Design a protein around this ligand. Structure first.
Ligand SMILES: Cc1nc2sc3c(c2c(=O)[nH]1)CCC3
Length: 186
């Protein structure tokens, strides 16, 4: 179960999200920003965060990243996050997983945030447990092993460019929490 709370332009939380979005997407008109409150999904995300925070030392395991999707996926994502049956997984080049962008402009592409019948576009500002990452490749269904001599000990995510990332691919449930939905237009 979940709730959706629309944020008022005056709210500092609205400002924070909007500021991030407008670094690359100020040419768009923001209609609204909503917080998604799904307790079970959040708890499960935090449970993953705790285990990663113990394991990776000084690593800042969490990033806030963007994900565009069609209107029709919003119900699915609000309930289940970016889980196995999430339809928006046609990008394959860095792995078969869910893609998140460092900057909003990637996610604002019409192929990802498909405008609906009323012209509105949908981008989530998502907490993602990027952890320790490496370069992705087309064949991945889970991250690569850190050392091939232990095939079961894997990276947390993959990226297009390890030292200047523009995207991250996550492969597991509870690795991303869909905290805010930004509804906007041209
Ligand atoms: C459905 C969806 N697919 C993809 S692939 C990709 C991004 C993206 C997104 O935001 N939504 C952002 C950068 C590379």
């Amino acid at each position: 179960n979940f709730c959706v709370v629309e944020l008022l332009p005056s709210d500092p939380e609205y400002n924070t999200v909007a500021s991030k979005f407008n670094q690359t997407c100020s040419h768009f008109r923001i209609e609204k920003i909503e917080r998604i409150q799904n307790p079970d999904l959040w708890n499960s995300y935090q449970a993953k965060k705790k285990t990663m925070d113990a394991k990776n030392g000084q690593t800042m395991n969490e990033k806030q990243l963007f994900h565009g999707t069609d209107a029709g996926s919003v119900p699915h994502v609000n309930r289940n996050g970016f889980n196995r049956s999430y339809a928006g997984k046609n990008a394959v080049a860095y792995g078969k997983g869910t893609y998140f962008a460092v900057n909003a402009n990637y996610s604002a592409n019409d192929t990802y945030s498909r405008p609906d019948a009323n012209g509105r576009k949908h981008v989530y500002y998502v907490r993602v447990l990027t952890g320790i990452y490496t370069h992705g490749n087309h064949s991945l269904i889970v991250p690569p092993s850190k050392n091939p001599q232990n095939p079961t000990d894997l990276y947390d995510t993959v990226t297009d460019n390890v030292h200047h990332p523009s995207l991250f691919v996550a492969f597991y449930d509870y690795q991303a929490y869909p905290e805010y939905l930004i509804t906007f237009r041209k």
